[PDB]
From a paper:
Aim: [name] subsp. infantis uses a glycoside hydrolase (GH) family 42 β-galactosidase ([name]) for hydrolyzing lacto-N-tetraose (LNT), which is the most abundant core structure of human milk oligosaccharides (HMOs). As such, [name] represents one of the pivotal enzymes underpinning the symbiosis between bifidobacteria and breastfed infants. [name] has a three-dimensional structure similar to other [name] enzymes that have three domains consisting of a (β/α)8 barrel (domain A), an α/β fold (domain B), and an anti-parallel β-sandwich (domain C). Glu-160 and Glu-318 in [name] were predicted to be the acid/base catalyst and the nucleophile, respectively, based on previous studies of [name] enzymes and sequence alignment.
First, we determined the structure of the WT enzyme complexed with glycerol (WT-GOL) at 1.7 Å resolution. The electron density of a glycerol molecule, which was used as a cryoprotectant, was observed at the active site, even though the crystals were grown in the presence of Gal. The asymmetric unit of the WT-GOL crystal contained one molecule of [name], and it forms a homotrimer with symmetry-related molecules by a crystallographic 3-fold axis. A PISA molecular interface analysis calculated that approximately 27% of the entire surface area of the trimer (17,082 Å of 64,278 Å) was buried. Our previous study using calibrated gel filtration chromatography also suggested that [name] forms a trimer in solution. The trimeric structure of [name] resembles a flowerpot, like other [name] enzymes. The glycerol molecule in WT-GOL occupies the C2-C4 position of the Gal.
Residue numbers in the entry:
A (entry chain A), B (entry chain A): 1 to 691
Write the structure that this text describes.
C-alpha cells in the first residue's frame, strides 16, 4: 500500500506561499451584488482561498445535458482578480431533483428496504452504475471548462463521502458485496471459515448466498464477521467511487486534489488511514466536542490527522467559528476559542485553515450553523476574530512556519478504524466498551503528565517510537502481533490495556487465555472478563485499585503473572467478588523491552494518576515541574531545526504561567513579560514562540 | 387438557441411572481432531449426555434433497463408545441459506410488512406450509437414520420456539389467525363481542375482516382483545408446529422427547404451562438475572419450572457457566456461583443439569458466550468447577436423589401467562405494572420470612394448598373465580393484590367495583386506581403506610370494607390526596377461610415487612428464628420419605450459620463442624444434607 506523491495547492502567479485561509463559499445562495461585498470582506479578513461549487449540481447542470457555468466563471474571476485562490469542487456531492426523479434507482436503500428520498443531501448509492455515469460526466465537463483557469489551484472531490450514504442495502450493494468478498477471499469456503458459518446454519454453497446484513428483527444478533466485512466493503465501495471521480478530473485537468475527511476521536465511518493513501494531500473536517473535552479532543483529532498524513503538512478544510446546527444542543464557542481552535490545528501540522462557511445561510437546513460572516454581519465579534486570525496566519508564514512538521513524540498511541468496527458488534462483553475512547483517554492522561503523544494509525510507523500504547486495540492480526512482539523484544516500551488483542482480523478469538497472541509479551493470562455497570440493583459498578484509582465498566480476571513480571497495582474489593488482591496493573520484562498491562478501564483521571509509576518503570522521562499538565506543548520544526516553533495552550480554567524560550510571535488571551521572560495564559489562551 | 405420559431419557445399555450432566455440543464448528479431545475432557468432567445437531441443517442437508450424515454418525459413535449419551436434535431449528434463497415465502414478516432476513437464526414463519414440509422431511430423514442407534436416548425437537419468530404478520399468519378465531369462537358475532368491536367502528361482517394487529401508527392503541388473542394464537401456532415435528419423529423413531422452554420470571413468549402438556418431560433454559436478584429469581424460575412439570422431575437443558453474550453488559458469575446455580435447579427438582455450551465458539455471534471449555481451555477455573460439579452430581445420585420430588410448600404463588399478556396493553392504568413482577416479589418476601413457596401455574392444583397468592393476577375467568370463591369458603387462606381480577379471559372488565368477580371474598370495594410515578414535576410518587412500609407505582382507592373484614394497615398522606387514613391492607372472613387484600405495590421489602402480621392473621406458621430469611431451604423427598434431601443456600453477603440435621453430602463455600453439628455458609455457598 503506497501513498500518492504529495502535492499541495500552489500560489496564484505572482503570490508567495501562505498558510491558506478561508472557507466554503456559496455565492449561488445569494444575489450577485452580495458577491462584490464578499470579496471586499475577504480581503479585509486576509482570506486567500475559498472552496466553491460543492453542492452546486442543480445550478451547474439545471436539466440533463444542459450546462450553465457562466455564474461560476464570473465569481471565480472576481475572486482571482482580488488575489483569492479557488479550491474548486467537482460539484458531484449531491444530485439534483431532475436526476433522482428520472432515476429512482440512484437512491440508497436502508436495512429494512426503505428508500432514502431527496430533501437533504448525498442520497445516492456508492455502487450505482447510473449515478457513477452522471458524476463522471459532470467531473469531465468541470475539468474541461476549468483546465486552464489561472485561479483554480486545487480540486475538492465530492464532499465527506459516507457521512450519509455509508450503508446501502440495495440490489446494487448486494451484487457489489458478493464481488468484494470473492475478490478478498477467493473461495466461498474461505468466506464460510472467516465468518464462522457452521454456527446457526449459515454455511453458503456459493457467492450468490452472500447477502447484506439487512433487517433480522431488532435486537437479534447479526453474523459478526459479516458485519465487520460489511463496514470494510462500505468504506471500499466509496473509495472506489472517489478514485474514479479523481481520475476523471485528473485525466483532463491535473491539479492537486483531495477529498475532505471527518477525522475525530469518535468518527469511524471510513477507514480514513486507508483513504489517506489516495489523496494528494490530507484534508479534514473537525468540529468541537462540547464541554470539558473540547480542547483535548480537538488536539487529539488534529494529531491523528497528522498521523494519517505521515507527518506531511495537511489541510483543515472545515471547522466552525462558533455553534454548529446538527447537535441536539448547539453550544457556542467562548471568547478566544475561535483563534485558539484554529491555532490548535495549525500546531498539529496544518498549513491551511478553513471554515464551513464564509457567509451564514439565511435559509435551509444549516441556517443556524455559524460562519465567518454571521447573520449579524461584519460588525460582529466573530468577524473581528476572523480578521485577527487572518493577520496571525500571515505573521506565522512570514516567520517560516510553512512546511515545518509536527515533531516526533516519545509516545505513539495506536488507532485502528477496524478495531473500532469490531467493538461495535451487539454481542460483545459490553456495549459500554468501544475502541475509540481508550486512545483519547491516554492522550489526555499523558498530557496531564507533561507529555504530548503522537497518534499513529496501526498501519503507520508506531514501532519506530520510544514507547507505544495499544488502547483497547481489539484486533491484533498475525502481522500486528509480530510487529508488537518484535518491537518489545528489541527494547521497545509498550502499554497494553483491557480489550486489546481479543481477536484476529477475521474476528476469530485468539484462544488459550487473553490476550491470546501476546500473553507472553505482557506476562499475564486473562481467563475471563468482569464487565461492570448499573443496569439492575446490586450490579458490580466499580473496582477500587490500591494505587488510589477506581475502575469502571470493565476489568480483566488475571489468573497468572509471569516470573518476569510484577504487579504494580491490585484491586481491592468485597471478598465474594473474587477481585480482592487480584492483579490490576502489571509490568513485564520481555527481551530487552518492557510491557505494562492495564487490566481495567481507569478513565482519563485513573490513567493520569497511574502513569507516574508506569512512566518511571518504563524509563520514559517527563518534566519534574508540578504544573506540567496545565498546558499542552505542541512543536513544529523543519528538518534542519533552523525554524522551530512552540505552541502553548492552556488546558485549564486557571491562569497558567509559562517560560518564554524564544521570540513571541502570536498571543491570544496571553500576556508576555519581557523582563522575566514569562507569560500568563488566560483560560482559552495560547502563545506561539519561535526558538 | 391431559398431560402426556411422563417419559425420561434412559441410560445407555450397561449404565446405571445418573443425574444427566453435559451441554449443547457443536462438533461441526471444529476440525475433527478436536472431537477426540472433547470426548477425553467430557470423561474428566463426568459429562454423561450432550445435545447435538441443534443448528446443523446446513451440514445435514447441504443442498435440497442431499443428506450428509456421516460426520454425525462418527461423532455419535465416539461419544457412545466413551459412555456418553446423545440427546439428538431434529436439526430443524433454523433453515439453510439455499432454502430461504429458493423460498423467500418462508421468512417471517414484521408488523410494518418488513421481511426478516437470514443472518441470525429462526427466521421462519410458524404458519408457512412450505417450511413445515421442509422441517417434517428432515425430521423423517433423521428419525429413519437414527431409529436403531444405541447411543441416542432422546429427541431435542427444534430449539426455543418463538425466541425470535413468536410474531409473524405475513399472509400465512393472516389466514391462520382467521381460522384460529373461527375455531375458538364459532361465529363472527362472538368475535365482535369478545373484542368489543362496537367501539371505534371495528365491527366485522365475516371472518375475512379479521386482520393481524399490524402497524397502526406508533403510539396508537390496538384493539386489546385482538392483541390478547394474537398472543394466544402465536403461541398455539408454534405449538401446532412443535406437535407436527414431534409426531413425525415419533412415528419412525419413538424415544423420549422434549422441546426446550425459556421459563424465567419475566419471559412469557409462549404459554409454557400449556406447552408442558405436549412434552414427554419438561426441559428449561434459564440464564441468571444480573445483580441482587440473581439467586432468588433463578430459584423462583426453577420453582415455576417444577410447577409446570406438576412436580415430576424436569431437565435443565441450558444455563451458563459464566457470562452470556446477549445483554448490553454481560456480567460474569462470581466464585462458587457455577456450582451453586446448578444445585439451585437441582434442588427445585431437576434430574439433569446441562449448559449452553460444551466448547466456547471462537467465531460467530455467540463467541463471547461462556462455555464449559472456555476460550482459555481446560486450564481454567471454569473447567475445574465443571469437573467438581460433575463429581458432586455423581455423589448425589449414589445417595438416592434421582426421582425424588420437590416437597409441597404451605404456599402456592399463582402464575398466569395470559394475565401477563393482558397487562401488556398500552392503554392500561399504568405501563409500570405488569403481572410478572408481583409473584416474584412474593416469592422473595416469603423467603425473607422463612418460607419457600411453590410457584403454581393457574391451571395447576393451587387450590390444594394451605395458602394461595393471587399476585397482580389481572385475569379471573368465570372458572378461576369459582375456584377462588370455593377455595376460601371451604377454609383456604388467600392473599390478593392490586391489579387482580380486573377482567375476564376476554379482557372485559368485571363491573360494580374492583375486583369485580370476588369483591365479597376480599371484603373490599375499589372504585378507582391511583397510579404513581415521577413523569412530571409534582406527580404523586409514593404513599406511606402506617405499618412502616411505602407504596410505589400503584394504589387502590378502597371505598368500603365488609363487616366481616378489618383494616390491618392504612395509608398516611397529605389530606388533599384523599388517601390519609384510607385502607391499604385488609383481612376478611369468608366462609371458613380468610382473604387478605394488599391494595398497593409494596415491593419485596414492603411485603417482607408486612407479612409477619398477615401470616399470623391467616394462621400460617413459620420459624421463630431471627435469621430465618438468611438461607433458602429447599427440600426433595421420595414418596415414602426414606430419601429426604435438604439444600441450604445463602441468600446474603454475610456468613450464614445453620444446623446440620443429617449427613452432609455436598458443600460449596461451606464448612461443617461435626462437633457442634453446624455449618458456616459463605456468600454464594450451599450445603446439601440427607436426613
Amino acid at each position: 500500500m503506497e501513498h500518492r506523491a504529495f502535492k499541495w495547492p500552489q500560489p496564484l502567479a505572482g503570490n508567495k506561499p501562505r498558510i491558506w485561509y478561508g472557507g466554503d463559499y456559496n455565492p449561488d445562495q445569494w444575489p450577485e451584488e452580495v458577491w462584490d461585498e464578499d470579496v471586499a470582506l475577504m480581503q479585509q479578513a486576509g482570506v486567500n482561498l475559498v472552496s466553491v461549487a460543492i453542492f452546486s449540481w442543480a445550478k451547474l447542470e439545471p436539466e440533463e445535458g444542459v450546462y450553465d457555468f457562466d455564474w461560476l466563471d464570473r465569481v471565480i474571476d472576481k475572486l482571482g482578480k482580488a488575489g483569492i485562490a479557488v479550491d474548486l469542487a467537482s460539484g458531484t456531492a449531491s444530485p439534483p431533483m431532475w436526476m433522482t426523479q428520472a432515476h429512482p434507482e440512484i437512491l440508497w436503500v436502508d436495512y429494512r428496504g426503505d428508500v432514502c428520498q431527496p430533501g437533504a443531501r448525498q442520497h445516492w448509492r456508492a455502487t450505482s452504475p447510473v449515478f457513477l455515469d452522471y458524476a463522471l460526466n459532470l467531473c469531465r465537463k468541470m475539468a474541461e471548462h476549468y483546465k486552464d483557469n489561472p485561479y483554480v489551484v486545487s480540486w475538492h472531490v465530492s464532499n465527506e463521502y459516507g457521512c450519509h450514504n455509508r450503508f446501502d442495502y440495495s440490489e446494487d450493494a448486494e451484487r457489489a458485496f458478493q464481488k468484494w468478498c470473492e475478490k478478498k477471499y477467493g473461495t466461498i469456503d474461505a468466506v464460510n471459515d472467516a465468518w464462522g458459518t457452521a454456527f446457526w446454519a449459515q454455511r453458503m454453497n456459493n457467492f450468490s448466498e452472500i447477502i447484506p446484513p439487512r433487517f433480522i428483527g431488532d435486537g437479534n444478533f447479526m453474523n459478526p464477521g459479516k458485519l465487520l466485512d460489511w463496514k470494510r466493503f462500505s468504506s471500499d465501495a466509496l473509495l472506489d467511487f472517489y478514485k474514479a471521480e479523481r481520475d476523471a478530473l485528473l485525466e483532463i485537468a491535473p491539479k492537486p486534489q483531495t477529498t475532505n475527511f471527518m477525522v475525530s476521536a469518535g468518527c469511524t465511518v471510513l477507514d480514513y488511514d486507508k483513504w489517506g493513501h489516495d489523496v494528494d494531500f490530507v484534508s479534514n473536517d473537525h468540529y468541537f466536542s462540547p464541554g470539558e473535552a473540547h480542547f483535548d479532543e480537538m488536539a487529539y483529532a488534529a494529531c491523528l490527522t497528522d498521523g494519517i498524513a505521515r507527518k506531511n503538512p495537511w489541510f483543515l478544510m472545515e471547522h466552525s467559528t462558533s455553534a454548529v446546527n446538527w447537535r441536539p444542543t448547539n453550544y457556542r464557542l467562548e471568547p478566544g476559542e475561535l483563534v485558539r481552535d484554529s491555532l490548535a490545528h495549525l500546531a498539529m501540522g496544518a498549513d491551511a485553515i478553513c471554515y464551513f462557511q464564509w457567509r451564514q445561510s439565511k435559509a435551509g437546513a444549516e441556517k443556524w450553523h455559524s460562519a465567518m460572516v454571521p447573520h449579524a454581519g461584519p460588525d460582529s465579534q466573530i468577524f473581528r476574530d476572523v480578521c485577527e486570525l487572518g493577520a496571525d496566519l500571515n505573521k506565522l508564514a512570514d516567520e517560516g512556519l510553512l512546511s515545518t512538521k509536527l515533531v516526533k513524540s516519545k509516545v505513539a498511541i495506536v488507532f485502528d478504524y477496524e478495531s473500532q468496527w469490531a467493538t461495535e458488534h451487539t454481542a460483545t462483553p459490553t456495549q459500554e466498551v468501544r475502541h475509540w475512547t481508550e486512545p483519547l483517554d491516554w492522550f489526555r492522561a499523558l498530557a496531564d503528565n507533561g507529555l504530548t503523544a503522537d497518534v499513529v494509525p496501526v498501519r503507520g510507523p508506531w514501532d519506530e517510537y520510544e514507547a507505544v500504547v495499544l488502547p483497547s486495540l481489539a484486533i491484533l492480526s498475525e502481522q500486528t502481533t509480530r510487529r508488537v512482539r518484535e518491537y518489545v523484544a528489541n527494547g521497545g516500551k509498550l502499554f497494553v490495556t483491557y480489550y486489546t488483542g481479543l481477536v484476529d482480523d477475521r474476528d476469530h478469538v485468539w484462544l488459550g487465555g487473553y490476550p491470546g497472541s501476546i500473553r507472553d509479551v505482557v506476562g499475564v493470562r486473562v481467563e475471563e472478563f468482569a464487565p461492570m455497570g448499573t443496569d439492575a440493583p446490586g450490579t458490580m459498578d466499580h473496582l477500587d485499585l490500591d494505587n488510589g484509582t477506581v475502575a469502571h465498566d470493565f476489568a480483566d480476571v488475571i489468573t497468572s503473572v509471569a516470573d518476569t513480571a510484577h504487579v504494580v497495582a491490585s484491586f481491592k474489593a468485597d471478598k465474594w467478588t473474587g477481585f480482592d488482591g487480584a492483579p490490576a496493573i502489571t509490568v513485564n520484562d520481555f527481551g530487552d523491552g518492557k510491557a505494562a498491562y492495564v487490566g481495567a478501564r481507569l478513565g482519563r483521571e485513573g490513567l493520569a494518576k497511574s502513569l507516574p509509576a508506569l512512566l518511571e518503570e518504563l524509563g520514559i522521562e517527563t518534566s519534574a515541574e508540578d504544573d506540567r499538565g496545565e498546558v499542552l506543548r505542541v512543536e513544529r520544526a523543519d528538518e534542519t531545526g533552523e525554524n522551530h516553533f512552540v505552541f502553548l495552550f492552556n488546558r485549564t480554567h486557571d491562569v497558567a504561567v509559562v517560560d518564554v524560550e524564544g521570540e513571541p510571535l502570536v498571543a491570544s488571551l496571553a500576556q508576555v513579560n519581557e523582563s522575566e521572560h514569562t507569560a500568563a495564559i488566560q483560560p482559552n489562551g495560547v502563545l506561539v514562540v519561535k526558538l
